[PDB]
Amino acid sequence: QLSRLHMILKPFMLRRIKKDVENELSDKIEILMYCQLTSRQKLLYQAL
Amino acid sequence: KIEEVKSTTKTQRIASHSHVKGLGLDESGLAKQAASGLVGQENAREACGVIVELIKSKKMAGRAVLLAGPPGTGKTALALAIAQELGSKVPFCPMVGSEVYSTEIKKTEVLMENFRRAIGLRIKETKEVYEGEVTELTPCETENKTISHVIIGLKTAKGTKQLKLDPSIFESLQKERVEAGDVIYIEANSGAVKRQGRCDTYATEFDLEAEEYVPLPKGDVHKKKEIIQDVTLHDLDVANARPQGGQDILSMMGQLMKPKKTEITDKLRGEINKVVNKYIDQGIAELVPGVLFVDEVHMLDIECFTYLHRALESSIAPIVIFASNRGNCVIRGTEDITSPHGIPLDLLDRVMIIRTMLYTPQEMKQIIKIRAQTEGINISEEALNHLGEIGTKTTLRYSVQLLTPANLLAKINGKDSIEKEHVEEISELFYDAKSSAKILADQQDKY
Amino acid sequence: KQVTVYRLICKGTIEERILQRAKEKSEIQRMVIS
Ligand SMILES: Nc1ncnc2c1ncn2[C@@H]1O[C@H](COP(=O)(O)OP(=O)(O)O)[C@@H](O)[C@H]1O
Structure with missing residues (x-):
């Protein structure tokens, strides 16, 4: 069914992925930054 | 892609009872073998299971227990277990028996400050307040000139008002060195003024100035709010005997002189009891009578043991926990007399003894x-x-x-x-x- | 220029459900394109 969606879409949707154009612009560095929630946060979160 | 995690500070410090989190009872009030940090002592924990329901029942006054048993048997740990079992809101007042030997007030009255600190009180205090940037400020004169009113123009994000206020507020504004552009807060019940510095609108007006600057206040100039105060009858008793409220030259200076304790008169505790009864009648107040824990009770003076006869028989008093690690001692201040736990037999009737064991x-x-x-x-x-x-x-x-x-x-x-x-x-x-x-x-x- | 992106999340709260649904959706959302 994915191949049916692709064969429907191919004649009327264009596609890229940036690396097919952007030979000289950066990829994102992406940071999942965790945080320790505070005392007032733990007190209200636990009460909820 | 990347992950990051942060922490930057030390823990709470560990301490000699910090493993105790409660009495470790079941729903029937029987003791579990090991729970809530405690182990063993099942009779003493079951007994304290009755006592935590005694505190929470509120009906009783001046009921007392004496935890008695050798060094290291957990007596002060069980009073700490009770203090955790009651949670934060019921006051638990720790005391050591040798704290009665003050050099400012009689031994027979340090106990009353401790008793009155162990009766907590929760008050729905309505505070009504003015706040804003001061946009205008003018006193209004009268013949002996004296000041009759002050006019303050106040501004907030929600608007502006121009208020007639008492000359005691003007005296407070002058004391606080308030000027136009200052963000201020005034509570009309205390007559008390707080300056917060010039409004952020003025933060560009000089290249170099001493001020902290604050964002313009929000909501209307005049507004009222509840503070749900937690307070104790001692904190009412002392606050009237050396008064720091009001705004006059005298109260402004009782706030500077050495904060000596004083032998609070029985009449003031009387007039305070009348005022808190009126706040309970008005539904503004809830009383939360708590616990006084006189650890090392075996060295109160006999003056103090004989005062406890009047205090434990008061209709007002908190519930009391004593502890003693002592045998058939001499009673302090007597030189002759020996008695169990170092406590007079006259007081030893007025206590439910909790035997704690090796x-x-x-x-x-x-x-x-x-x-x-x-x-x-x-x-x-x-x-x-x-x-x-x-x-x-x-x-x-x-x-x-x-x-x-x-x-x-x-x-x-x-x-x-x-x-x-x-x-x-x-x-x-x-x-x-x-x-x-x-x-x-x-x-x-x-x- | 170089690019850096940060997400701020609280462990064990509710935002990890949002991140888990976001990961589950992002995996479904890849295969329907490439
Ligand atoms: N039943 C118990 N369960 C857990 N810890 C206990 C128990 N009994 C005593 N302790 C701990 O052992 C030590 C001695 O008890 P403690 O209360 O200080 O004795 P004492 O009654 O003589 O003052 C403390 O660290 C205390 O917290």
Whole structure:
């Protein structure tokens, strides 16, 4: 069914992925930054 | 792609009762074998199970218990268990019996300050307040000129108002050096003014100025709010005897002079009781009568033991917990008289005694385990079994006290956990009260 | 230029459900394109 969606879409949707154009612009560095929630946060979160 | 995690500060410090989190009772009020940090003491914990329902019932006044039993049997740990079992809102007032020997107030009255601190009170205080940037400020004159009113123009994000206020507020604004552009807060009940510095609108107006600047206040200039105050009857009693409220030259200066205690008159506690009864009648107040814990009670003076007869028979008094580690002592201040727990037989009727008792080796091992995992340390079973043996040789406190010193020795020696080779060294470095008394009796010619 | 992106999340709260649904959706959302 994915191949049916692709064969429907191919004649009327264009596609890229940036690396097919952007030979000289950066990829994102992406940071999942965790945080320790505070005392007032733990007190209200636990009460909820 | 990347992950990051952060923390930047120390923990709470560990302390001698910090493993105790409650009495470890079941729904029937029976004691679990090991729960909430405590183990053993099932009779004393079941008894304290009645007492935590005694406190929470509120009906009773001046009921008292005496925890009695040898050194290290957990008496002050059980009063700490009660303090945790009641939670934060019911006041628990810790006291040590030797705190009555003040140099500012009579021994017979330090007790009343402690009693009155143990009756808590929750008040829905409505405070009504003015706040804003001061956009205009003018006093209005009258013949002996005197000031009759002040006009203050105040501004907030929600608008502006221009208020007639009392000359005591003007005297407060002058005291606080308030000027146009200052953000201020005034509460009309206290007549009390707080300056917060010039509004952020003025933060560009000089290249170099002493001021902190604040964002313009929000909501209307005049507004009222509840503060749900927690307060105690002592905190009402003292606050009237050396008054720091109001705004006059006298109250402004009672706030500077040395804060000496004073023998609060029985009449003031009378007029305070009338005022808090009116706040309870008005539904503004809830009383929360709590606990006074006189630890080491065996050394109150006989003056104090005889005062406790009047205090424990008061219709107002909190519930009281005493503790004693003592046998048939002489009663302090008498020189002649000896009695159980060091407490007069006259007072020893007025208390439900909770007998607290010595430990089996199994309970010592189990406390030492629960204690080791509270001090944050890993200990091998052969080393913990060896501390159980040191418990049978000496005392529970010495056996507990070796744990952290053994963990320092272990991490110096490069191990992750206490091995028996560490405890067997710490036992040689640090004597206990029994083993030191042997060398100190043998060498008694030279001390 | 170089680009850096940060997400701020609280462990064990509710935002990890949002991140888990976001990961589950992002995996479904890849295969329908490439
Ligand atoms: N039943 C118990 N369960 C857990 N810890 C206890 C227990 N009994 C005593 N302790 C702990 O052992 C030590 C001695 O008890 P403590 O209350 O200080 O004795 P005392 O009544 O003589 O003042 C303290 O560290 C205390 O927290």
